Paper text:
Here we describe subclass A3 evasins, which are unique to the tick genus Amblyomma and distinguished from “classical” class A1 evasins by an additional disulfide bond near the chemokine recognition interface. Structures of chemokine-bound EVA-A revealed a deep hydrophobic pocket, unique to A3 evasins, that interacts with the residue immediately following the CC motif of the chemokine.
To achieve this, we mutated residues Tyr44 and Leu39 in the CC + 1 binding pocket to Ala and Pro, respectively; Pro was chosen as it occurs in the corresponding position to Leu39 in several class A3 evasins. We found that the Y44A and L39P mutants exhibited increased affinity to most chemokines with aromatic CC + 1 residues but decreased affinity to most chemokines with aliphatic CC + 1 residues. In the case of L39P, the affinity decreases were only small so this mutant bound to 21 of the 24 available CC chemokines with affinities tighter than 100 nM, compared to 17 chemokines for wild type EVA-A. Consistent with their increased affinity for chemokines with aromatic CC + 1 residues, both the Y44A and L39P mutants exhibited substantial enhancements in their potencies for inhibition of both CCL2 and CCL7. In addition, both variants inhibited the receptor-mediated phosphorylation of ERK by CCL2 as well as by the same eight chemokines as wild type EVA-A. To validate the structural basis of enhanced binding and inhibition of chemokines with aromatic CC + 1 residues, we determined the structures of EVA-A(Y44A) in complex with CCL2 and both mutants in complex with CCL7.
Numbering used by the authors:
A (entry chain A): 22 to 103
B (entry chain B): 1 to 70
Write the structure that this text describes.
């Protein structure tokens, strides 16, 4: 699995690690999955629709497990940087 | 004033496992943000494909050292 492509992550104003939006990324013709344990955000469809360059919603932190961003209860002010 | 909102957000979630010979790589080198989950450097193959490399592995440090001195 040639799944070693870089991918855009989301930042936050909380001073914690950048996190993948969900647990999947496209790389060299393959739908790749982040490794189990990897930090992620699990956003609702509505939250993704309005995601922008500053936080405007409380973003659920999660941990990737077999492709699912399993929420852990921590909430962060996440945003995307173009 | 908070900083770190200005960090770049491209990160490597997986690495190339096996060593890639230097003849297959270009002169491209980009260090990812220290805010990324995993410390990584991005190289580019001669087919213009960006690849994630782990700078704790010895061949990666070797290639970066080679890229330094011309």
């Amino acid at each position: 699995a040639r799944c070693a492509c870089p991918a855009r992550h989301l930042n936050n104003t909380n001073g914690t690690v950048l996190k993948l939006l969900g647990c999947h990324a496209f790389c060299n013709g393959t739908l790749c999955t982040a490794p189990d344990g990897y930090p992620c955000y699990n956003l609702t469809a509505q939250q993704v629709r309005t995601l922008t360059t500053y936080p405007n919603t409380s973003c659920a932190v999660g941990v990737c497990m077999k492709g699912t961003c399993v929420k852990n209860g921590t909430m962060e002010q996440c945003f995307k940087t173009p | 004033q908070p900083v770190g909102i200005n960090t770049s957000t491209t990160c490597c979630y997986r690495f190339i496992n096996k060593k890639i010979p230097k003849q297959r790589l270009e002169s491209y080198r980009r260090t990812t943000s220290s805010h990324c989950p995993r410390e990584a450097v991005i190289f580019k193959t001669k087919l213009d494909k960006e690849i994630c490399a782990d700078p704790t592995q010895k061949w990666v440090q070797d290639f970066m050292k080679h890229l330094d001195k011309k």
